[PDB]
Structure formats: structure tokens, C-alpha cells
Amino acid sequence: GDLATTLERIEKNFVITDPRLPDNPIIFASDSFLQLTEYSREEILGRNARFLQGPETDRATVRKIRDAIDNQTEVTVQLINYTKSGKKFWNLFHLQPMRDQKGDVQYFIGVQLDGTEHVRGELMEKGIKEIKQTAEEIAEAALLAALKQQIKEIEEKIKKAEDNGDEDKVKELREKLDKLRKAYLILALLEAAKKGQIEEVRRLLELGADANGADGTGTTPLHLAAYSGHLEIVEVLLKHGADVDASDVFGYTPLHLAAYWGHLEIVEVLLKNGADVNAMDSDGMTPLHLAAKWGYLEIVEVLLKHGADVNAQDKFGKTPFDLAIDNGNEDIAEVLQKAA
């Protein structure tokens, strides 16, 4: 529906199927896939994908696919597949279920790697990372389309109630909505921020998106923007009052991520907005430990302007000076002496 709209922004080879409809038919096919298979939406959608198979198609592999589908697990296979015309091609394809149908499996995602020639080794292991991560992407898009869909429906159930003059049921839904909708803007913001979409971050924050919405891992929009080196987004997120010292699972504040990845300008913004210069991660690494270990001298110099404790230790007793020495960053060690 609206599903079928953003899915076209994803210019990669894949399909989606619904295991809840019988014989698990294709509900979406990408332009890459339709071009490659010499088919059209009309002649494949609502159809089970075994039409790809032929005599040369490895029957054991088909059963590995069957089994993964029935058991709701992922699976990565390479095998021979057939165009409309009967042209054989190598399909290196990843299958993964889309979960959270109330914490469940509602869809299967099948990402094929662009290629008709049998791939091998680390050429192949890269392509597997690619189509694995292409599928992560689609799960994200598909979830949002679903939450968008529920909000449409609840808004219509309000109207129905509003006209029945059912004020007690109008407030019982308006409270479900607000929950579901906050939840949406949180996911839309994390992804807007990942992709550095500065206008969509802006647009969202102004619909009252929670700038402190974490993913599962305590990863906030600020962590993503810091990781990716998106300055204008880091700045706007601080303007809408996002916690500059959000930790994740791992102990990482955005200042840790900016340090690891050498985003100097973003290190500066964070500090100027009151970042805990001396925040430790779960391994007692401070941002100074990280800039020193990985040889980001300018980031070391900026950290020290704003109070970095040069005597701070990690769970191995090492100071930032001790790690510059261990990584042969002689220049950085010399600065951590001139401030020791």
C-alpha cells in the first residue's frame, strides 16, 4: 500500500512474502528482481516463488529454504534460479523473517545479490554482509509502514467513537495513539538521524519527536549522528534538548563515538554543550583513552582544553599516556606528558 512506496526508494534486488496467506506468496517485488527474472508485478505478485526453480536447481538447497521458512529462522544460500525465458542464473540470496507482529513473524524478506555468476570466498562473504544489511534496512522500513498503518486505523476508530458520542472510548484510543505515535516518531528520528536526513530530523522534532528516544541498545539519535559525523544534526538535537551524556549498553556516550571515529568538530560541539569529558565506558575507557589509543592528536588537544583527566585508568590500569606509548603515538604521549 504505502508500504509499496518507500520500498521503491530501496533500489536493490529483493521480494517480501506473507507466510500468513497460504503458500507464502510474494506481496512485493523490487525493480532489480523483476528486471533480472524478466517478469512483471502482475504475473508474480500473489504467486509462490518456486517458479524461480528448475531442473539444475539444487533440491537439497530448496529443502534448507523450506526448513528455515517452516522454523522461522534466517538462511543464506547460493543456487541456480530461472528467468521467465528459462535462462539459468546464480542466486546468492539471504532469507530473514520480519518479526514484531506483537513480537512474532508476519513477513519473510528475500534479498538476492546483483550477480548471475557463481561467487566464492571473501568476494561472497562481503556480498552476504551487503544483502544481510540490505534486509536489516527493509525490516526497519516495513515496521514503520506497519505502525503508520495502525495509526491510520486508530484515528478512524476515534472518528467512529466521536460520532457515537462515546467520550470514554474517544479518550481510551487517543491514549493508545499518543503511545503508538511517540513510538513511531522515535523510530523515524533514529533512522532520519542514521541517514543524516537533516530536514526530516528538523520536520520530526517539530512534530514533538522525543530527542531522547533510544533503540533497544540505549543508542539515541545523538549517538547515531555522532557515529556518522553529522554536525548540523548533532547541533539541532542539542537545541531540542537531547541528553549530551546518553550512555548505551556498552558505556558509549556520543563523545566516545565522536572520538573513536575522529569527528573533531562534533567532539567540540559536544564539549561546548557540557559533555562529561571524563565519562567511562564499561571498560573504563574515557574519550581521551580512545583519541590517544587511535592517534587523533587534535581531538586529544581539544579534550584537554575542556578538562580531560590525564590520570584516569581503564580496567587494565592504563592511562591515555600509557596507550599512546603502546600504539607508538610518540607525539600524543609527549602532549599527555606536557599536561601530566
Coordinates of C-alpha atoms in Angstrom, one line a residue:
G1 CA 0.0 0.0 0.0
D2 CA 2.0 3.0 1.4
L3 CA 4.4 0.0 2.2
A4 CA 4.9 -0.3 -1.6
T5 CA 6.0 3.4 -1.8
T6 CA 9.3 3.7 0.3
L7 CA 10.2 0.1 -0.8
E8 CA 10.9 1.7 -4.3
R9 CA 13.4 4.2 -2.7
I10 CA 15.4 0.9 -1.9
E11 CA 16.9 0.3 -5.4
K12 CA 18.1 -3.2 -4.5
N13 CA 17.1 -6.8 -5.6
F14 CA 14.6 -8.5 -3.2
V15 CA 11.0 -9.6 -2.5
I16 CA 8.6 -9.9 0.5
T17 CA 6.2 -12.8 1.2
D18 CA 3.4 -13.3 3.7
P19 CA 3.6 -16.7 5.4
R20 CA 0.1 -16.0 7.0
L21 CA -1.5 -16.1 3.4
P22 CA -1.5 -19.8 2.2
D23 CA 1.5 -21.0 0.1
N24 CA 3.5 -17.9 1.3
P25 CA 3.0 -15.7 -1.8
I26 CA 5.1 -12.6 -2.9
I27 CA 3.4 -9.3 -1.8
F28 CA 6.2 -7.1 -3.1
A29 CA 9.0 -7.5 -5.8
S30 CA 11.7 -4.8 -6.4
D31 CA 12.6 -3.4 -9.9
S32 CA 16.0 -5.1 -9.8
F33 CA 14.3 -8.5 -9.2
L34 CA 11.6 -8.0 -11.9
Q35 CA 14.3 -6.9 -14.5
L36 CA 16.6 -9.9 -13.5
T37 CA 13.7 -12.5 -13.7
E38 CA 12.2 -11.0 -16.9
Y39 CA 8.8 -10.8 -15.1
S40 CA 6.3 -8.0 -14.1
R41 CA 4.4 -7.3 -10.8
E42 CA 1.2 -8.6 -12.4
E43 CA 2.5 -12.1 -13.3
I44 CA 4.4 -12.8 -9.9
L45 CA 2.6 -10.9 -7.0
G46 CA 0.2 -13.3 -5.1
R47 CA 2.4 -16.2 -6.5
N48 CA 4.8 -18.5 -4.5
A49 CA 8.4 -18.1 -5.6
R50 CA 9.1 -21.8 -6.6
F51 CA 8.7 -20.6 -10.2
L52 CA 12.3 -19.5 -9.9
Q53 CA 13.3 -23.1 -9.6
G54 CA 14.3 -25.5 -12.5
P55 CA 15.9 -28.9 -13.2
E56 CA 19.5 -27.5 -12.4
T57 CA 18.2 -26.0 -9.1
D58 CA 19.8 -27.9 -6.1
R59 CA 16.9 -29.9 -4.5
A60 CA 18.8 -30.2 -1.1
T61 CA 19.2 -26.3 -1.0
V62 CA 15.4 -25.9 -1.7
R63 CA 14.8 -28.1 1.4
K64 CA 17.2 -25.9 3.5
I65 CA 15.0 -23.0 2.4
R66 CA 11.7 -24.9 3.1
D67 CA 13.1 -25.8 6.6
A68 CA 14.3 -22.2 7.5
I69 CA 10.8 -20.9 6.5
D70 CA 8.8 -23.5 8.5
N71 CA 11.1 -23.0 11.6
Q72 CA 11.1 -19.1 11.2
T73 CA 15.0 -18.8 11.1
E74 CA 17.2 -16.9 8.6
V75 CA 19.3 -18.8 6.0
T76 CA 21.9 -17.7 3.3
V77 CA 22.2 -20.0 0.2
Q78 CA 23.6 -19.8 -3.3
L79 CA 21.7 -21.9 -6.0
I80 CA 20.6 -21.9 -9.7
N81 CA 17.3 -19.9 -10.5
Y82 CA 15.4 -19.4 -13.8
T83 CA 14.1 -16.3 -15.6
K84 CA 10.7 -16.4 -17.4
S85 CA 12.6 -17.3 -20.6
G86 CA 14.4 -20.3 -18.8
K87 CA 17.8 -18.5 -18.6
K88 CA 19.7 -20.0 -15.6
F89 CA 21.4 -17.6 -13.2
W90 CA 23.2 -18.0 -9.8
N91 CA 21.1 -16.6 -6.9
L92 CA 23.2 -15.8 -3.8
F93 CA 20.2 -14.9 -1.6
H94 CA 19.5 -14.1 2.1
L95 CA 16.1 -15.0 3.7
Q96 CA 15.1 -13.4 7.0
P97 CA 11.7 -13.2 8.8
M98 CA 10.2 -9.7 9.7
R99 CA 9.3 -10.1 13.5
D100 CA 7.3 -7.9 16.0
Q101 CA 3.8 -8.9 14.7
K102 CA 3.1 -8.5 18.5
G103 CA 6.6 -10.0 18.9
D104 CA 6.2 -12.6 16.1
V105 CA 6.8 -13.3 12.3
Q106 CA 4.4 -11.6 9.8
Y107 CA 6.7 -11.4 6.7
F108 CA 9.7 -13.1 5.0
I109 CA 12.4 -10.9 3.3
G110 CA 14.4 -12.4 0.4
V111 CA 17.4 -10.3 -0.7
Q112 CA 19.3 -11.5 -3.9
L113 CA 22.8 -10.2 -4.6
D114 CA 23.2 -8.4 -8.0
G115 CA 25.2 -11.1 -10.0
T116 CA 24.4 -14.1 -12.2
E117 CA 28.0 -15.6 -11.9
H118 CA 28.8 -18.1 -9.0
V119 CA 30.6 -16.1 -6.3
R120 CA 33.1 -17.6 -3.7
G121 CA 35.3 -16.9 -0.6
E122 CA 35.5 -13.4 0.7
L123 CA 34.1 -11.9 -2.6
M124 CA 31.0 -13.8 -1.4
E125 CA 31.3 -13.2 2.3
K126 CA 31.1 -9.4 1.6
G127 CA 28.0 -9.8 -0.7
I128 CA 26.5 -11.8 2.3
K129 CA 27.2 -8.8 4.6
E130 CA 25.7 -6.5 2.0
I131 CA 22.4 -8.4 1.4
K132 CA 22.2 -9.1 5.2
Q133 CA 22.4 -5.3 5.8
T134 CA 20.0 -4.7 2.8
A135 CA 17.5 -6.8 4.7
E136 CA 18.0 -5.1 8.1
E137 CA 17.2 -1.9 6.1
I138 CA 13.9 -3.4 4.7
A139 CA 12.8 -4.7 8.2
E140 CA 13.2 -1.1 9.5
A141 CA 11.1 0.4 6.6
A142 CA 8.5 -2.4 6.9
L143 CA 8.0 -1.9 10.7
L144 CA 7.4 1.9 10.1
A145 CA 4.9 1.2 7.3
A146 CA 3.0 -1.1 9.8
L147 CA 3.0 1.4 12.7
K148 CA 1.9 4.1 10.1
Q149 CA -0.9 1.7 9.1
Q150 CA -2.1 1.1 12.8
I151 CA -2.2 4.9 13.4
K152 CA -4.4 5.4 10.3
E153 CA -6.9 2.7 11.8
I154 CA -6.9 4.0 15.4
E155 CA -7.5 7.6 14.0
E156 CA -10.6 6.2 12.1
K157 CA -11.8 4.3 15.3
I158 CA -11.7 7.7 17.1
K159 CA -13.9 9.3 14.5
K160 CA -16.4 6.3 14.7
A161 CA -16.4 6.7 18.6
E162 CA -16.6 10.6 18.2
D163 CA -19.8 10.3 16.2
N164 CA -21.3 7.6 18.6
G165 CA -20.7 10.4 21.2
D166 CA -18.6 7.9 23.2
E167 CA -16.3 10.3 25.1
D168 CA -14.9 7.4 27.4
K169 CA -13.8 5.3 24.2
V170 CA -12.5 8.6 22.4
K171 CA -10.1 9.1 25.4
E172 CA -9.2 5.3 25.6
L173 CA -7.9 5.4 21.9
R174 CA -6.4 9.0 22.0
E175 CA -4.1 7.5 24.8
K176 CA -3.3 4.3 22.7
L177 CA -2.4 6.6 19.7
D178 CA -0.1 9.1 21.6
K179 CA 1.8 5.9 22.8
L180 CA 2.0 4.3 19.3
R181 CA 2.7 7.7 17.7
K182 CA 5.6 8.7 20.2
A183 CA 7.0 5.2 19.4
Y184 CA 6.8 6.0 15.6
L185 CA 8.5 9.4 15.8
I186 CA 11.3 7.8 17.9
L187 CA 12.0 5.1 15.2
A188 CA 11.5 7.7 12.3
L189 CA 14.0 10.0 14.2
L190 CA 16.7 7.3 14.8
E191 CA 16.6 6.5 11.1
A192 CA 16.3 10.1 9.9
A193 CA 19.5 10.6 12.1
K194 CA 21.3 7.4 10.8
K195 CA 20.9 8.6 7.2
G196 CA 21.8 12.2 8.2
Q197 CA 18.4 13.4 6.9
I198 CA 18.7 16.9 8.4
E199 CA 15.3 18.3 7.1
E200 CA 13.5 15.1 8.2
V201 CA 15.2 15.3 11.7
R202 CA 14.0 19.0 11.8
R203 CA 10.5 18.2 10.5
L204 CA 10.1 15.3 13.1
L205 CA 11.5 17.2 16.1
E206 CA 8.8 19.9 15.4
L207 CA 6.0 17.3 15.4
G208 CA 7.3 16.7 19.1
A209 CA 9.6 13.7 18.4
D210 CA 11.4 12.6 21.7
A211 CA 15.1 13.5 21.0
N212 CA 15.9 11.1 23.9
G213 CA 14.3 8.0 22.3
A214 CA 16.8 5.1 22.5
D215 CA 16.8 1.9 20.3
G216 CA 17.0 -1.4 22.2
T217 CA 20.7 -0.8 22.8
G218 CA 20.3 2.7 24.5
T219 CA 21.6 4.1 21.1
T220 CA 19.9 7.6 20.7
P221 CA 19.6 9.9 17.7
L222 CA 22.7 11.8 19.1
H223 CA 24.8 8.6 19.2
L224 CA 23.9 7.9 15.5
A225 CA 24.7 11.5 14.4
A226 CA 28.0 11.4 16.4
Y227 CA 29.0 8.0 14.9
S228 CA 28.2 9.3 11.3
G229 CA 29.8 12.7 11.8
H230 CA 26.5 14.6 11.0
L231 CA 27.4 18.0 12.7
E232 CA 24.2 20.0 11.8
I233 CA 22.1 17.1 13.2
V234 CA 24.2 16.8 16.4
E235 CA 23.7 20.7 16.8
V236 CA 19.8 20.6 16.2
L237 CA 19.4 17.6 18.5
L238 CA 21.1 19.6 21.3
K239 CA 18.9 22.6 20.5
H240 CA 15.8 20.3 21.1
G241 CA 17.4 19.3 24.4
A242 CA 18.8 15.8 23.9
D243 CA 20.8 14.3 26.7
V244 CA 24.5 15.1 25.7
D245 CA 25.7 12.2 28.0
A246 CA 23.2 9.4 27.0
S247 CA 25.1 6.1 27.6
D248 CA 24.3 2.9 25.6
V249 CA 24.5 -0.8 26.6
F250 CA 28.3 -0.6 26.0
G251 CA 29.0 2.6 28.1
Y252 CA 29.4 4.7 25.0
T253 CA 28.3 8.4 25.1
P254 CA 28.3 10.2 21.7
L255 CA 31.6 11.8 22.8
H256 CA 33.1 8.3 22.9
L257 CA 31.8 7.6 19.3
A258 CA 33.0 11.1 18.0
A259 CA 36.5 10.3 19.5
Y260 CA 36.7 6.7 18.1
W261 CA 35.7 7.9 14.6
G262 CA 37.8 11.2 14.7
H263 CA 34.9 13.7 14.2
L264 CA 36.8 16.7 15.8
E265 CA 34.1 19.3 15.0
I266 CA 31.5 17.1 16.8
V267 CA 33.8 16.5 19.7
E268 CA 34.0 20.3 20.0
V269 CA 30.2 20.8 19.9
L270 CA 29.5 18.1 22.5
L271 CA 32.1 19.6 25.0
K272 CA 30.7 23.2 24.4
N273 CA 27.3 21.7 25.4
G274 CA 28.5 20.2 28.7
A275 CA 29.5 16.6 27.7
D276 CA 31.1 14.7 30.6
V277 CA 34.7 14.9 29.2
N278 CA 35.6 12.0 31.6
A279 CA 32.7 9.6 31.0
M280 CA 34.0 6.0 31.2
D281 CA 32.6 3.1 29.1
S282 CA 32.2 -0.4 30.6
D283 CA 36.0 -0.9 30.0
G284 CA 36.9 2.3 31.9
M285 CA 37.9 3.9 28.5
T286 CA 37.3 7.7 28.6
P287 CA 37.2 9.7 25.2
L288 CA 40.9 10.7 25.9
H289 CA 41.9 6.9 26.2
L290 CA 40.2 6.5 22.7
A291 CA 41.7 9.6 20.9
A292 CA 45.2 8.6 22.4
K293 CA 44.9 4.9 21.5
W294 CA 43.7 5.6 17.9
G295 CA 46.0 8.6 17.2
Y296 CA 43.6 11.6 16.9
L297 CA 46.1 14.3 18.2
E298 CA 43.8 17.4 17.5
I299 CA 40.9 15.5 19.4
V300 CA 43.4 14.9 22.3
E301 CA 44.3 18.7 22.3
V302 CA 40.6 19.8 22.3
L303 CA 39.8 17.2 25.0
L304 CA 42.5 18.7 27.3
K305 CA 41.2 22.4 26.8
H306 CA 37.9 21.0 28.5
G307 CA 39.3 19.1 31.5
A308 CA 40.2 15.6 30.3
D309 CA 41.6 13.7 33.4
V310 CA 45.1 12.6 32.1
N311 CA 45.5 10.1 35.1
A312 CA 42.1 8.3 34.6
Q313 CA 42.6 4.5 34.2
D314 CA 40.8 1.6 32.3
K315 CA 40.1 -1.9 33.8
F316 CA 43.7 -2.7 32.7
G317 CA 45.2 0.2 34.8
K318 CA 46.3 2.1 31.6
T319 CA 46.2 5.9 31.3
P320 CA 45.7 7.7 27.9
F321 CA 49.6 8.4 28.0
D322 CA 50.2 4.6 28.6
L323 CA 48.1 3.7 25.4
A324 CA 49.8 6.4 23.1
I325 CA 53.1 4.7 24.1
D326 CA 51.7 1.2 23.5
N327 CA 50.4 2.3 20.0
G328 CA 53.7 4.2 19.2
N329 CA 51.8 7.6 19.0
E330 CA 55.0 9.3 20.4
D331 CA 53.8 12.8 19.6
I332 CA 50.5 12.4 21.5
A333 CA 52.3 10.8 24.5
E334 CA 54.6 13.9 24.6
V335 CA 51.5 16.2 24.9
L336 CA 50.0 13.9 27.7
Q337 CA 53.4 14.5 29.5
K338 CA 53.2 18.3 28.9
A339 CA 49.9 18.1 30.9
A340 CA 50.5 15.1 33.2

